[PDB]
Amino acid sequence: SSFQSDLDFCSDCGSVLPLPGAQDTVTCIRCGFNINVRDFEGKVVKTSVVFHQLGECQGPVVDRRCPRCGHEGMAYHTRQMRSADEGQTVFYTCTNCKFQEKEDS
Amino acid sequence: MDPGSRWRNLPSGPSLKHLTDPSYGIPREQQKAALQELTRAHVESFNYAVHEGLGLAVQAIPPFEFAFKDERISFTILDAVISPPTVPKGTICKEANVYPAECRGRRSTYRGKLTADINWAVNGISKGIIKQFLGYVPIMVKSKLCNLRNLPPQALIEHHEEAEEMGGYFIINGIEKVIRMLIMPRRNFPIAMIRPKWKTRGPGYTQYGVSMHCVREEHSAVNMNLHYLENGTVMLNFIYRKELFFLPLGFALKALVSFSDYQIFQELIKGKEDDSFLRNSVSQMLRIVMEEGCSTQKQVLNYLGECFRVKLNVPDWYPNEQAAEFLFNQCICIHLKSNTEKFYMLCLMTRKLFALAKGECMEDNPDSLVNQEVLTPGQLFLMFLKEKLEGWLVSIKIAFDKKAQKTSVSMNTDNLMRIFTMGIDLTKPFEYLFATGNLRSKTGLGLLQDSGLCVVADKLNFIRYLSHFRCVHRGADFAKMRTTTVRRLLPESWGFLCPVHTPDGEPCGLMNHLTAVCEVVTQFVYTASIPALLCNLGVTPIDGAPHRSYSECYPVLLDGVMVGWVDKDLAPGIADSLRHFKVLREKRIPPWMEVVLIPMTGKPSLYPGLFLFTTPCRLVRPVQNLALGKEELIGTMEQIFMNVAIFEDEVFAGVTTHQELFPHSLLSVIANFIPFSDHNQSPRNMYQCQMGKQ
Amino acid sequence: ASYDEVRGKWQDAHLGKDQRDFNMIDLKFKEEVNHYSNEINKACMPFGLHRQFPENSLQMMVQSGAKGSTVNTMQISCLLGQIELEGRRPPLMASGKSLPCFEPYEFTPRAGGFVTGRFLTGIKPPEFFFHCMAGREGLVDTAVK
Amino acid sequence: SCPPNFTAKPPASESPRFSLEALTGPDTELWLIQAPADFAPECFNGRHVPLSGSQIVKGKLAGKRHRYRVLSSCPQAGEATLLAPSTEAG
Amino acid sequence: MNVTLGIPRLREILMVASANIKTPMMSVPVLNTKKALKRVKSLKKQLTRVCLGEVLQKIDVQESFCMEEKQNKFQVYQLRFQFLPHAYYQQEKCLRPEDILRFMETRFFKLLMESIKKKNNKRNVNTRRATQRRVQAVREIHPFIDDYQYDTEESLWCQVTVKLPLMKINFDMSSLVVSLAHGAVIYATKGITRCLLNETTNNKNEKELVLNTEGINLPELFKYAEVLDLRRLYSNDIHAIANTYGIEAALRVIEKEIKDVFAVYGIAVDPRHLSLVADYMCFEGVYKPLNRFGIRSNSSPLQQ
Amino acid sequence: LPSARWQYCGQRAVLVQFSNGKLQSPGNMRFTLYENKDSTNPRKRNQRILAAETDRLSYVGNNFGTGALKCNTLCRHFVGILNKTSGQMEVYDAELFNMQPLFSD
Ligand SMILES: [Zn+2]
Ligand SMILES: [Zn+2]
């Protein structure tokens, strides 16, 4: 008339057995049903912590002459940095010498 | 478009013929049914919160039993009503009612008498019933307690009010003050969070955690957290009157149910059965409860009623088994009456935390409107009124404890009752919340902020006045942060909040305004037949076993209550036959239910399930379900899984399942009034929306 | 590779806590759609306007330094171009669809904010919601910090 | 030590047996049919229920030809065990 | 590389004049001689901090139980450490995978067996917080080791079979092992995080390889002189040039560290304004701040 | 395509859950069931208490108390027989019990 619980729980009540210790039988606390410590050989708990399992032309161009190198085409990016009352703001960025100037419209 | 859609009366083009007519200047006998859909969430919420919710919030006040000299005085409020505003008694007058146009011009408050039936009883025998004037509460104009209720537009010009008087506002000392709609977290739902501020809360915590905003019948609100720990152990935090409580998970689940520990083991391992660290951790959490000699439910209840008795402020005569069911009644999952469905909910919060900590489900974005709802003016009225009723009872207790010192004749009461004259009067502590906006509570009412609740409805023009009744304010504490994520436009606000209509300075991104089609769900219905309907479909309930294994089965969560386990090959076919009941109004499926089937992909997507929401105070918007041909109230979380279409040409076969009503539905009322919005730039529109309001 | 396999690879690039291979698919759409943002402006802007400079008043205000730029005129009479949002294309949802109109993980540049319609003729509603994101981004990053 | 082995029940009492069968032989295969909450069981009273897959079986009350759908299953080792009363122990 | 930009760098220079600054760099060009270019590929590698949570793939903890006598009953652990392959880092020291095993065999386990015997040797709470918020050489390390097994064909794993006794509570050895596995392996060169020679940039057509490190150790680079042209060195740290190259070159670093803060943001300031700030802050010989602790040097009480 | 024949007879076939594990070992275990008295109300057809005594422990199972499962009210349970000789799945009525072991007071 024995049941099939997990190894860590009693199989007459459902309460949790404690850990092993100073004896050969681990006992429950509310039914006195004792199980051998030899039955806990197959208690193998695994854990795997994983660290490293696997292992734009800066935007569109516009024909604007660069201040430094004099290249004919700079790449731009717009961004609205003032309030909603006025303006946009255009950030140019050259292809050759990578120079970055801004304008406020 | 469907007849009855509220948008069938949308004009083809502008007319201009309505200002050269003989009808111009004759008041109609029917207010217009399109200007009244803008204060509907303000007025219907107050209607629930002075009639039904007040009777459901004097039942959740427990009986007030305290100790006299070896007797036991017991109070309870049986019923509480609010009268519509009249003149004081003794006034020689002809029309006894008081109308709002008097209270604006005289600069007083439009307020109604609150009074209740208290039931005093000594030593358990019911020995009286006293009708006690508690105070005056403010009445919303055009609600079911205003004296302008259901008047036609000609009888409303006679009482000095405008025709098209939409309501939504309190007259407090002559100044009209609306309660705006704050964003609260999504009620009765696990929200997977990752916050590294939680690592410094206890000894060995982890960032991972699941929160829940719990609300009971629109009148109480409590947040509770879970926390993953590096052991695999789960904790459970909750604040009860500025006292943060720590509580392990086994101490909650053993105190809730009388199940054996093998079933509490089994409920927490349902999907993840081959795992080895998880079974070890859910063994440790129950072993912790086994440590202190707490093997049954009553022993855990005595233990937690002895540890948590001095800060719960229970009386000096309860058994500790009742002073521990007092904390599960008011702090842990208040939205479920059963202690069994609190257990089956803490198991789902715990398993969402396990699948979040292992990195198998992604963080639910707390700032996205997928996981956000709105707070209506019926919630903040009913919550604060409930708390002040309890505070009135506590003030009666303080009146007796002050009458005991410097002792009077002090006889047995027998309806003597000069104490109720000396009780606290909630005229002024209830007026203060409206008059200043400063919430004053020993609880916090489940809200994350203290000020910024009532806003003066200014009326400089009519563009400004509408957009106090469409405002969705994110938070009155996020204005001071250096953040950008809580004030950034996200694509899940399509149809529910307006992209352009927000201010541009410091309240940018916080003060959102609703779109035109969007609407707050305020009608409260009952969910009795829906669990039996689901189990008549393929929902195998919790206690039985599904015919396929778990991890090939979705949880089902009907408005905070765990219901069952749907097989994987049935859950698409259940999410269709619950939209094919909502769009056709069948089998008591409400029209505002969110059938949300988060699918099983096998990748770290959202936590899979079939989540059915029916509660109020959400956001919802109408679309056209193309398969039937009828209007569907898509909610905030359904439309991250639906392929809606804007234009008829963009409707394809098999891919497209819905269609928006009219293609400019994404815009607010005020941002529609901008002519040719699609040709001017976006901060021009965001600046025009605050030109028109000036 | 079929499009479901590539779509599964880009779902796997998404949803991961690396977010490095997902910021590399942005940087390969944002190249291929700016080889179409330039080929439009070479066809419409210099010699394709209705009146050219000096007759054109907008080109006179732009080229003589009065107010404008050669970017605002291209947003008026050619495409608006790619909408970048704090450096990248606009955010996919928690379900991998760009906006409720668009299919989950849709390959087309219209899903990532490539507006390709002007302020002259008109902006359709998705290309408008993306544009409002890019405007609120700048107004928030000014108003807060 | 001293377990209860309870027999204490104030409003209750034992019961006799029923005249059903008591046999589980080589031919009898135990099926555990799980029915909806309002299912009148004479609605299938001569119809073929499937023993594999799924099949839209017909009802009786509304006369609908695919009103119910009987889902067949597999060996689940369902923990419910039948207590069929026997004739050797009355 | 990245630096600190804007006002909290200008305040970091002029207002606090910090000894410990956030993101400090160091820049040395290369001789452009063919012998001294093979060496810089190795020297970029020999200064990067290779950490153990950078070459490790996964930790595989496996707790069991083992009992043979009335006292000999134990908790057998097993820590299988997969290391990431040598092909997946060609930027760090050419750290050939026998070295990340000899690190384990020498000095990981001395940290592990000290963390173990610091933890258990002297969660469950209801406290009501009243506020709001060689295998014979490895076995020689301790007798708790039962077994050691490293990979021989390749060089990728390691299994300590730690055999601990029984306790009351079961502590986590996937929390101690993970927290100890955030630690420097063999050489973190003292005050240098990473090195970046990937700049082949030039100003007047030089093809000048520029190292640009993320940390500051001046005498670490002084011993590489046939490969690094130390005549043209640079730093952010004024306190690491005032104490190595003098105050009269910690004054041609203040000017460049103000100009290269304004010129990130497009602003250009005339050098006659900056050389008045460098010749005021380096007036007393030390690098004083312009704050409440640089007004004590002044003479007028009505200005202080 | 296997098929059968539905034949509903009507008696209750009691079905047992255990709060601690599978049974897996039938032996020397008593089984008695304790219905309610009054048949004028429908409590005679609803109230029932199952007793399953073993020499070690004894198990009590209700239909009304806090601990009774909600799979017999929100769902109906049957038991098939499948007499394959005549080819009929003759089907009875069932009810599911979930027994807790009895310890103390
Ligand atoms: Zn036991
Ligand atoms: Zn250039």
PDB file of C-alpha atoms in Angstrom, chain C:
ATOM      1  CA  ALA C   1      16.772  30.244 -47.479  1.00  0.00           C
ATOM      2  CA  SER C   2      13.003  30.649 -47.385  1.00  0.00           C
ATOM      3  CA  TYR C   3      11.505  33.766 -45.849  1.00  0.00           C
ATOM      4  CA  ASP C   4      10.182  31.878 -42.822  1.00  0.00           C
ATOM      5  CA  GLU C   5      13.719  30.709 -42.008  1.00  0.00           C
ATOM      6  CA  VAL C   6      15.131  34.241 -42.376  1.00  0.00           C
ATOM      7  CA  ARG C   7      12.180  35.550 -40.368  1.00  0.00           C
ATOM      8  CA  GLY C   8      12.925  33.029 -37.630  1.00  0.00           C
ATOM      9  CA  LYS C   9      16.571  34.106 -37.620  1.00  0.00           C
ATOM     10  CA  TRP C  10      15.535  37.741 -37.209  1.00  0.00           C
ATOM     11  CA  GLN C  11      13.083  36.768 -34.480  1.00  0.00           C
ATOM     12  CA  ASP C  12      16.052  35.073 -32.798  1.00  0.00           C
ATOM     13  CA  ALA C  13      18.143  38.221 -33.308  1.00  0.00           C
ATOM     14  CA  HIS C  14      15.315  40.029 -31.539  1.00  0.00           C
ATOM     15  CA  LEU C  15      14.145  38.758 -28.089  1.00  0.00           C
ATOM     16  CA  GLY C  16      17.746  38.116 -26.992  1.00  0.00           C
ATOM     17  CA  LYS C  17      19.624  40.019 -24.327  1.00  0.00           C
ATOM     18  CA  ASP C  18      22.631  40.546 -26.601  1.00  0.00           C
ATOM     19  CA  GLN C  19      20.817  43.022 -28.937  1.00  0.00           C
ATOM     20  CA  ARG C  20      23.972  43.200 -31.060  1.00  0.00           C
ATOM     21  CA  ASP C  21      23.010  41.099 -34.054  1.00  0.00           C
ATOM     22  CA  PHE C  22      19.694  42.971 -34.068  1.00  0.00           C
ATOM     23  CA  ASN C  23      21.526  46.287 -34.333  1.00  0.00           C
ATOM     24  CA  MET C  24      23.310  44.824 -37.358  1.00  0.00           C
ATOM     25  CA  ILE C  25      20.127  44.150 -39.334  1.00  0.00           C
ATOM     26  CA  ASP C  26      19.165  47.796 -38.754  1.00  0.00           C
ATOM     27  CA  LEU C  27      22.564  48.767 -40.176  1.00  0.00           C
ATOM     28  CA  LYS C  28      21.902  46.770 -43.339  1.00  0.00           C
ATOM     29  CA  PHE C  29      18.409  48.063 -44.054  1.00  0.00           C
ATOM     30  CA  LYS C  30      19.564  51.606 -43.253  1.00  0.00           C
ATOM     31  CA  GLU C  31      22.173  51.178 -45.995  1.00  0.00           C
ATOM     32  CA  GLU C  32      19.980  49.655 -48.703  1.00  0.00           C
ATOM     33  CA  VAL C  33      17.198  52.208 -48.175  1.00  0.00           C
ATOM     34  CA  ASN C  34      19.644  55.118 -48.441  1.00  0.00           C
ATOM     35  CA  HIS C  35      20.755  53.932 -51.846  1.00  0.00           C
ATOM     36  CA  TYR C  36      17.121  54.665 -52.732  1.00  0.00           C
ATOM     37  CA  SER C  37      16.932  57.935 -50.788  1.00  0.00           C
ATOM     38  CA  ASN C  38      19.715  59.330 -53.010  1.00  0.00           C
ATOM     39  CA  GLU C  39      18.525  58.020 -56.360  1.00  0.00           C
ATOM     40  CA  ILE C  40      15.222  59.862 -55.813  1.00  0.00           C
ATOM     41  CA  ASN C  41      16.946  63.144 -54.959  1.00  0.00           C
ATOM     42  CA  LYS C  42      19.182  62.935 -58.030  1.00  0.00           C
ATOM     43  CA  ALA C  43      16.054  62.526 -60.178  1.00  0.00           C
ATOM     44  CA  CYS C  44      13.764  65.142 -58.672  1.00  0.00           C
ATOM     45  CA  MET C  45      15.593  67.881 -56.782  1.00  0.00           C
ATOM     46  CA  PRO C  46      18.240  69.698 -58.979  1.00  0.00           C
ATOM     47  CA  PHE C  47      16.818  69.697 -62.522  1.00  0.00           C
ATOM     48  CA  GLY C  48      13.379  68.310 -61.811  1.00  0.00           C
ATOM     49  CA  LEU C  49      11.635  71.118 -60.000  1.00  0.00           C
ATOM     50  CA  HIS C  50       8.927  73.210 -61.639  1.00  0.00           C
ATOM     51  CA  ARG C  51      10.831  76.496 -61.482  1.00  0.00           C
ATOM     52  CA  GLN C  52      14.576  76.329 -60.876  1.00  0.00           C
ATOM     53  CA  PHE C  53      16.976  78.746 -59.222  1.00  0.00           C
ATOM     54  CA  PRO C  54      17.007  81.853 -59.392  1.00  0.00           C
ATOM     55  CA  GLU C  55      13.293  81.929 -60.269  1.00  0.00           C
ATOM     56  CA  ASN C  56      12.464  79.551 -57.428  1.00  0.00           C
ATOM     57  CA  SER C  57      11.799  81.375 -54.193  1.00  0.00           C
ATOM     58  CA  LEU C  58      12.517  78.398 -51.936  1.00  0.00           C
ATOM     59  CA  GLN C  59      15.815  77.705 -53.692  1.00  0.00           C
ATOM     60  CA  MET C  60      16.599  81.409 -53.339  1.00  0.00           C
ATOM     61  CA  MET C  61      15.980  81.288 -49.596  1.00  0.00           C
ATOM     62  CA  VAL C  62      17.991  78.096 -49.264  1.00  0.00           C
ATOM     63  CA  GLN C  63      20.979  78.785 -51.505  1.00  0.00           C
ATOM     64  CA  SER C  64      21.478  82.461 -50.593  1.00  0.00           C
ATOM     65  CA  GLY C  65      21.660  81.590 -46.909  1.00  0.00           C
ATOM     66  CA  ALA C  66      18.351  83.177 -45.917  1.00  0.00           C
ATOM     67  CA  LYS C  67      16.652  80.432 -43.883  1.00  0.00           C
ATOM     68  CA  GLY C  68      16.362  76.932 -45.255  1.00  0.00           C
ATOM     69  CA  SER C  69      18.547  73.997 -46.191  1.00  0.00           C
ATOM     70  CA  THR C  70      18.788  71.423 -48.966  1.00  0.00           C
ATOM     71  CA  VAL C  71      17.269  68.899 -46.559  1.00  0.00           C
ATOM     72  CA  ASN C  72      13.974  70.657 -45.862  1.00  0.00           C
ATOM     73  CA  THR C  73      13.357  71.172 -49.578  1.00  0.00           C
ATOM     74  CA  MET C  74      13.956  67.464 -50.145  1.00  0.00           C
ATOM     75  CA  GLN C  75      11.508  66.628 -47.381  1.00  0.00           C
ATOM     76  CA  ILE C  76       9.028  68.943 -49.107  1.00  0.00           C
ATOM     77  CA  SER C  77       9.397  67.906 -52.741  1.00  0.00           C
ATOM     78  CA  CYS C  78      11.031  64.431 -52.477  1.00  0.00           C
ATOM     79  CA  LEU C  79      11.040  61.720 -49.804  1.00  0.00           C
ATOM     80  CA  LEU C  80      11.281  62.261 -46.067  1.00  0.00           C
ATOM     81  CA  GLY C  81      13.679  59.339 -45.987  1.00  0.00           C
ATOM     82  CA  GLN C  82      14.510  56.938 -43.209  1.00  0.00           C
ATOM     83  CA  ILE C  83      13.040  57.678 -39.793  1.00  0.00           C
ATOM     84  CA  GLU C  84      15.795  57.068 -37.261  1.00  0.00           C
ATOM     85  CA  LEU C  85      14.759  56.921 -33.625  1.00  0.00           C
ATOM     86  CA  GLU C  86      17.573  57.478 -31.066  1.00  0.00           C
ATOM     87  CA  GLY C  87      19.999  56.076 -33.648  1.00  0.00           C
ATOM     88  CA  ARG C  88      17.990  53.129 -34.980  1.00  0.00           C
ATOM     89  CA  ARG C  89      14.827  52.211 -36.836  1.00  0.00           C
ATOM     90  CA  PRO C  90      11.560  52.559 -34.851  1.00  0.00           C
ATOM     91  CA  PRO C  91      10.871  49.924 -32.187  1.00  0.00           C
ATOM     92  CA  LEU C  92       9.274  46.620 -32.972  1.00  0.00           C
ATOM     93  CA  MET C  93       6.542  45.660 -30.560  1.00  0.00           C
ATOM     94  CA  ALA C  94       6.647  42.823 -28.055  1.00  0.00           C
ATOM     95  CA  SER C  95       5.201  40.598 -30.803  1.00  0.00           C
ATOM     96  CA  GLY C  96       7.620  41.523 -33.559  1.00  0.00           C
ATOM     97  CA  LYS C  97       5.341  43.694 -35.664  1.00  0.00           C
ATOM     98  CA  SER C  98       6.278  47.289 -36.333  1.00  0.00           C
ATOM     99  CA  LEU C  99       2.844  48.856 -35.956  1.00  0.00           C
ATOM    100  CA  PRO C 100      -0.603  47.151 -35.935  1.00  0.00           C
ATOM    101  CA  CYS C 101      -0.868  47.508 -39.701  1.00  0.00           C
ATOM    102  CA  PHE C 102       2.268  45.533 -40.481  1.00  0.00           C
ATOM    103  CA  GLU C 103       2.834  41.789 -40.455  1.00  0.00           C
ATOM    104  CA  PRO C 104       5.077  40.296 -37.730  1.00  0.00           C
ATOM    105  CA  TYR C 105       8.694  40.726 -38.872  1.00  0.00           C
ATOM    106  CA  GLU C 106       7.902  42.257 -42.246  1.00  0.00           C
ATOM    107  CA  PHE C 107      10.843  42.668 -44.568  1.00  0.00           C
ATOM    108  CA  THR C 108       9.692  45.774 -46.476  1.00  0.00           C
ATOM    109  CA  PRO C 109      11.341  49.154 -45.758  1.00  0.00           C
ATOM    110  CA  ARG C 110       7.907  50.636 -45.059  1.00  0.00           C
ATOM    111  CA  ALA C 111       7.904  48.608 -41.827  1.00  0.00           C
ATOM    112  CA  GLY C 112      11.013  50.333 -40.532  1.00  0.00           C
ATOM    113  CA  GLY C 113      10.006  53.903 -41.122  1.00  0.00           C
ATOM    114  CA  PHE C 114      11.164  54.492 -44.684  1.00  0.00           C
ATOM    115  CA  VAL C 115       8.479  57.058 -45.344  1.00  0.00           C
ATOM    116  CA  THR C 116       9.071  57.706 -49.097  1.00  0.00           C
ATOM    117  CA  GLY C 117       6.197  60.165 -49.289  1.00  0.00           C
ATOM    118  CA  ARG C 118       6.560  63.923 -49.018  1.00  0.00           C
ATOM    119  CA  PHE C 119       4.944  66.851 -47.230  1.00  0.00           C
ATOM    120  CA  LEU C 120       3.830  68.070 -50.657  1.00  0.00           C
ATOM    121  CA  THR C 121       1.548  65.226 -51.689  1.00  0.00           C
ATOM    122  CA  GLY C 122       0.867  63.634 -48.311  1.00  0.00           C
ATOM    123  CA  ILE C 123       1.911  61.214 -45.574  1.00  0.00           C
ATOM    124  CA  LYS C 124      -0.069  57.998 -45.018  1.00  0.00           C
ATOM    125  CA  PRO C 125      -0.911  57.136 -41.333  1.00  0.00           C
ATOM    126  CA  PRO C 126       1.937  54.650 -40.571  1.00  0.00           C
ATOM    127  CA  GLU C 127       4.565  56.957 -42.072  1.00  0.00           C
ATOM    128  CA  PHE C 128       2.957  59.660 -39.869  1.00  0.00           C
ATOM    129  CA  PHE C 129       3.106  57.700 -36.608  1.00  0.00           C
ATOM    130  CA  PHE C 130       6.808  57.023 -37.235  1.00  0.00           C
ATOM    131  CA  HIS C 131       7.340  60.722 -37.920  1.00  0.00           C
ATOM    132  CA  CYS C 132       5.608  61.666 -34.681  1.00  0.00           C
ATOM    133  CA  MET C 133       7.936  59.298 -32.809  1.00  0.00           C
ATOM    134  CA  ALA C 134      10.934  61.041 -34.368  1.00  0.00           C
ATOM    135  CA  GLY C 135       9.547  64.451 -33.381  1.00  0.00           C
ATOM    136  CA  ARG C 136       8.656  63.552 -29.787  1.00  0.00           C
ATOM    137  CA  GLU C 137      12.151  62.061 -29.409  1.00  0.00           C
ATOM    138  CA  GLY C 138      13.805  65.402 -30.066  1.00  0.00           C
ATOM    139  CA  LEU C 139      11.272  67.399 -28.060  1.00  0.00           C
ATOM    140  CA  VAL C 140      11.679  65.059 -25.070  1.00  0.00           C
ATOM    141  CA  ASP C 141      15.493  65.013 -25.292  1.00  0.00           C
ATOM    142  CA  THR C 142      15.387  68.816 -25.269  1.00  0.00           C
ATOM    143  CA  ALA C 143      12.754  69.314 -22.576  1.00  0.00           C
ATOM    144  CA  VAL C 144      14.208  66.885 -20.007  1.00  0.00           C
ATOM    145  CA  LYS C 145      17.979  67.344 -20.192  1.00  0.00           C
TER     146      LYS C 145
END
